[PDB]
Design a protein around this ligand. Structure first.
Ligand SMILES: O=C(O)C(=O)C[C@H](O)[C@H](O)CO
Ligand SMILES: O=C(O)C(=O)C[C@H](O)[C@H](O)CO
Ligand SMILES: [Mg+2]
Ligand SMILES: [Mg+2]
Lengths: 385, 385
């Protein structure tokens, strides 16, 4: 058995998505997500111009070997572009193996550990009043967990520039959660995304102020290239901590996990090298009772969601799954076997990861440049968005 | 003052090279290296399709702000592709600032700390006899330091597959250095590149066996994604340790440095985000008396070498500079103001980093795909090349 082609497909059914399709001389084929929001074409080149030519002729059944080949063979290891390419290959290969086995992917990973996959939605508002309303809406839709984000009073052809001020946020954010618990009580899981805006001391300060509100987690409270950054936070607060959507290898989280500085690892199948590698991250996390909390914004295509759900269905130390709804056009371009119902996602029995791509339809939505925004402090200082 | 264009130029005068040219409305321009061996086009896309459009209209004098903008603004941080792009921008901007100041780059960094730049050459042989002869050649040429690599008995358009066996190497490499010292004595600096082939224990074993031969350094002895990997080596041998050519940010070396696990940091201007970032790496290293030993293979264009030499001329804790001669064609495409003389490199007084690119000549050498080799053990296990 041999790989006869590894093609990259680009489409924009509401937003940009890059997909890798691996074809074999035995009819069966697999697809993987390679989307890197804001830098999509760099991954297209990485795959199309370098990796794909190497895959031709290889035995697609050798998932581990190919993973090691692309990971070690690159010589320059790790990285967002590098790991997105590896992830696309890995997803496509697991898709092929599950199809060949005649089973939905989760069966190959070890079988079902749960029925439904708990998710959380995004309740946003320009102020506390509006955000409180948004959370109520998600509660009415049957969500068990809701992430609440509010604008702070006083604070995509090219990157939009957003402003930020820590003191203003510190004086406002706690009030949001105080009102939420006062309004809806403590039955629902409430989440907050710090989005890399605080220093460790400020994150500890915020976490402490949020303690009486029992949050499910405070996410990405401070930049984590330095894994010691969560030390001060963990030492001063019991508010659960989550991090990792931008991580791409287990090396980005090894210390955060072993030093027990986090409660949830947010790494994803597309961000951290496919099922092959994400499984290793989850296993390490399980040793310290850290649970998975896979990132799941819309810039992760339905192919990733399919793989993520198969993973979530099997993984023992499952925590929660982020869920942002894709547009109808995206759902049409990426036929998938998973659905949402009363606060939970469910993956189907379709062999493979259950997702596919309609190449003919995909071609009707041409690529369109789009950037993530950037953030600057009031004095103009480049900050973390 | 504004950036009017940020163009990517590709040329293959003996091997592939990618250059970024930043033009301004004032007229002055700067160039930077963006070459990523074996994955060159991914950086081309990263710069051409994403970063470049953002630079237009920016004030090229704001080197630090632009570095932070591209680094933080990408959202997905670090990585070989990411940092190569950032380095190309940084090199071009420093080139511009030095031209505007009317001074060679080293003057802007803090002035001259030394006259010549000590380098090491590459003595290679199929066996010990041949390698010993090769080292004698570099000694003849006036090299104060020589890297010695030998083939081990019993051990392009697509990646070549090389073989490897640790036990065979462990039984042979020590003999190479024993013969070198017996033949040439201890006056010259002798280096060895383990090239990621050993586990920490084996590296510690090799390190101890090489101790009687007083090496300048044992390089990349074991894969370092896990910075704790050098612990065992450092605990068991006094042989100097070097690592870092594949690193792209200070985060890849922070622990190796602070835990005093290495003696030389090999990060480069092109690999680790330009002068702006490499400077921070060098400063951290100096606190622990770790010295710079910049990587300098041919896949680093003359633009990188120029910037590297300006850096080497100033940096207080300079250790050594690797030097692999480029082809005559490459030197013609990249006119530079630096030269070699009796084991030392010297940077010139030309304002900027002293290097430029002849676009008309560059266009005569079209890109040609070339991959780095991969390594497999005797049983077929994918290994580190
Ligand atoms: O939903 C979240 O948790 C996010 O932070 C969304 C991210 O900004 C987005 O996926 C970046 O592409
Ligand atoms: O010369 C050295 O130290 C090297 O290891 C060379 C590398 O293999 C080469 O630059 C990779 O592109
Ligand atoms: Mg987030
Ligand atoms: Mg080396």
């Amino acid at each position: 058995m041999k790989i006869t082609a590894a093609r990259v497909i680009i489409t924009c059914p509401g937003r940009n998505f890059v997909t890798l399709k691996i074809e074999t001389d035995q009819g069966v084929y697999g697809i993987g997500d390679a989307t890197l929001n804001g830098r999509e074409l760099s991954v297209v080149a990485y795959l199309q111009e370098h990796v794909a030519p190497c895959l031709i002729g290889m035995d697609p059944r050798r998932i581990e070997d190919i993973w090691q080949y692309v990971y070690r063979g690159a010589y320059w290891r790790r990285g967002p572009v590098t790991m997105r390419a590896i992830a696309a290959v890995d997803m496509a290969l697991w898709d092929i193996k599950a199809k060949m086995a005649g089973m939905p992917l989760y069966q190959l990973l070890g079988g079902r550990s749960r029925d439904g996959i708990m998710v959380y939605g995004h309740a946003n508002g320009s102020d506390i009043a509006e955000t409180v309303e948004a959370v109520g809406h998600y509660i009415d839709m049957g969500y068990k967990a809701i992430r609440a984000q509010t604008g702070v009073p006083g604070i995509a052809s090219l990157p939009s520039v957003t402003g930020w001020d820590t003191r203003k946020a510190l004086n406002y954010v706690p009030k949001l959660f105080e009102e939420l618990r006062k309004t809806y009580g403590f039955d629902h899981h409430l989440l907050h995304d710090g989005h890399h805006r605080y220093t460790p001391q400020e994150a500890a300060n915020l976490g402490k102020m949020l303690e009486p509100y029992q949050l499910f987690w405070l996410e990405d409270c401070t930049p984590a290239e330095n894994q010691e950054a969560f030390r001060l936070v963990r030492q001063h607060t019991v508010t659960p901590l989550a991090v990792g959507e931008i991580f791409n290898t287990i090396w980005d989280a090894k210390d955060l996990i072993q030093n027990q500085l986090i409660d949830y690892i947010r790494a994803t199948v597309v961000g951290a090298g496919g099922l092959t590698h994400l499984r290793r991250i989850a296993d390490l996390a399980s040793l310290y009772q850290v649970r998975t909390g896979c990132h799941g914004a819309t810039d992760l295509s339905p192919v990733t969601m399919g793989c993520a759900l198969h993973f979530d269905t099997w993984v023992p130390n499952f925590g929660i799954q982020e869920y942002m709804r894709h547009t109808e056009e995206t759902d049409a371009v990426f036929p998938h076997d998973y659905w949402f119902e009363k606060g939970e996602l469910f993956v189907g029995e379709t062999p493979g990861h259950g997702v596919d791509i309609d190449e003919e339809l995909a071609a009707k939505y041409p690529y369109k440049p789009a950037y993530l925004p950037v953030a600057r402090l009031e004095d103009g200082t480049m900050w973390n968005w």
